[PDB]
Each structure stands twice: as structure tokens, then as C-alpha cells.
Amino acid sequence: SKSADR
Amino acid sequence: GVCWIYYPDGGSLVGEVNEDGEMTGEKIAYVYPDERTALYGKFIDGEMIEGKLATLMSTEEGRPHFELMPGNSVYHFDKSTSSCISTNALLPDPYESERVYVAESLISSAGEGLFSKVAVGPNTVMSFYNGVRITHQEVDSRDWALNGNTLSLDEETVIDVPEPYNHVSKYCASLGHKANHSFTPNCIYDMFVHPRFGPIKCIRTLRAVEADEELTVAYGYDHSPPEAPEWYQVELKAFQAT
Numbered sequence: 001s002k003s004a005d006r
Numbered sequence: 007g008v009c010w011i012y013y014p015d016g017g018s019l020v021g022e023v024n025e026d027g028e029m030t031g032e033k034i035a036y037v038y039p040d041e042r043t044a045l046y047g048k049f050i051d052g053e054m055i056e057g058k059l060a061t062l063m064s065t066e067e068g069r070p071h072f073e074l075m076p077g078n079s080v081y082h083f084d085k086s087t088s089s090c091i092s093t094n095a096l097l098p099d100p101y102e103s104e105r106v107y108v109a110e111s112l113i114s115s116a117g118e119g120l121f122s123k124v125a126v127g128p129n130t131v132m133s134f135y136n137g138v139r140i141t142h143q144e145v146d147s148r149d150w151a152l153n154g155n156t157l158s159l160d161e162e163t164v165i166d167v168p169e170p171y172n173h174v175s176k177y178c179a180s181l182g183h184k185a186n187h188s189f190t191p192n193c194i195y196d197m198f199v200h201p202r203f204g205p206i207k208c209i210r211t212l213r214a215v216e217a218d219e220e221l222t223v224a225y226g227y228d229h230s231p232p233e234a235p236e237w238y239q240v241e242l243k244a245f246q247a248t
């Protein structure tokens with residue numbers, strides 16, 4: 001969720 | 007009997023393997039994806055114990071012949087933990103140092119950005135995104151203000167470059183956290199297995215880029231859970247409009 005490129 | 011073992015990202019380990027099948031010896035090298043820049047020296051079962059910066063000058067019957075660069079650059083395997091980004095935060099990666107530099111972004115109010123030093127072709131690894139290794143629970147439970155640099159690695163791990171390491175005066179071992187977001191990007195994030203950093207992500211070009219071009223990647227936040235910082239949410243609307 002609160003991170004890039006999941 | 008020399009062997010080469012390639013990772014999917016195009017880096018490799020090369021050397022004579024030992025009595026078992028193992029990359030262990032004093033003359034083993036990791037060769038970066040340019041197939042020219044190398045870290046050469048002592049490895050044990052493929053882990054870099056002491057790699058010296060070298061250039062791969064030729065191969066003869068498959069055997070690589072290196073020249074060591076001047077200086078005393080020695081690198082070793084030094085995977086981050088949840089609390090330690092690097093044993094040598096100020097020692098730059100020598101491949102990245104030839105390819106990228108940090109300057110003010112061309113995107114208005116986006117702080118610093120990552121730029122190409124040199125013209126390159128498509129599919130070129132430019133920069134590495136190393137950082138501390140924390141859980142999705144920690145990142146997802148906490149405010150966006152703390153999550154400017156969080157990059158998902160896999161289902162278990164998020165890589166972060168927390169303050170003050172987001173300043174190049176405190177941390178410059180890698181620079182991937184300096185690339186800004188675009189919905190029309192020239193690069194992607196991609197998996198990378200690095201001999202110093204371990205399993206991380208890199209910034210890889212999608213297309214040819216010119217010298218001094220800003221490198222950008224799509225950050226890829228969830229648009230329909232948008233779960234994203236305000237500046238991105240703005241930018242999404244504008245993108246969808248075009």
C-alpha cells in the first residue's frame with residue numbers, strides 16, 4: 001500500500 | 007574450466023569453480039551488466055569477501071582477463087538490515103557513478119532528481135535502489151510523510167531510505183531513491199542482485215536516453231484500493247485528463 005512498485 | 011553464472015538482470019559471477027560446484031577462490035569476479043566493469047578478488051560460495059574494482063579487457067577461451075583500476079577500492083557483501091543501510095554509506099557504487107548524477111529536478115517543486123551522465127540505449131541498468139529492509143505492516147500503518155522513499159521489494163520486504171540518508175551528504179552508496187515519478191517515464195524499477203547490496207531493485211531504461219536527461223519511473227501506487235501522496239494524486243488527475 002504505502003510503498004512504490006507493489 | 008571457467009564458469010559464468012548470469013543473473014536475470016545481466017550481471018554475472020565468473021571464475022574457476024572449486025572441487026564442489028562453488029564460486030570460491032581468490033580470482034573470482036562479479037561483472038556488472040555493462041559486461042566491462044568488475045569487482046575481482048576473494049569470493050566464498052559466490053559471496054564477495056574482497057572485490058577490487060577492475061575492467062574486463064578481453065576473454066580468451068572464455069576466461070576473462072582483467073586490469074585492476076588504480077586506487078585501493080575494496081568492496082564486500084554488506085546487505086542492509088532493518089536498522090543499518092550500509093557499513094560504508096559514503097562509498098559510491100563505481101558502476102552507478104559513471105552513469106548518473108543528482109541535481110535539482112526539472113519537475114517543478116519535486117526537489118532533487120536523478121540524471122544521466124552519458125547517452126545509453128534501451129534496457130540499460132543506470133542506478134541501484136538500496137535501503138533499510140522493513141515490513142509492509144510498518145510502512146502501511148504509518149503516515150505518508152514517512153513514506154516518501156519506500157519501495158516494495160517483494161511480499162515480505164519494503165526498502166526505505168529514511169531521513170537523514172535521503173541527503174547525498176549522508177548517503178551516496180546508491181542513488182536510485184533520487185529518481186522522480188512520471189506517468190510518462192523513461193525507466194522502470196526492476197529486480198537486481200548486487201554483490202554488495204544483495205537482492206534489491208535497480209532503475210533500468212525503457213528506451214534510449216541522452217546525456218543529461220532526467221531519469222523518471224512510474225511509482226505505481228494503487229489507483230483504486232488512490233492510496234498515494236497528494237502530489238501524485240494531483241498528477242494522476244492531470245494525466246488521466248490528457
Ligand SMILES: C[S@@+](CC[C@H](N)C(=O)[O-])C[C@H]1O[C@@H](n2cnc3c(N)ncnc32)[C@H](O)[C@@H]1O
Nearest residue numbers: 113115116117118154155183184185186187237
Ligand atoms: C524517491 S524520492 C525522489 C527524490 C526526491 N525528489 C529528493 O529530492 O530526494 C521521493 C520524493 O520525491 C518527490 N517527488 C517525486 N516525484 C515527484 C513528482 N512527479 N512531483 C512532485 N514531487 C515528486 C516527492 O517529494 C517524493 O516524496
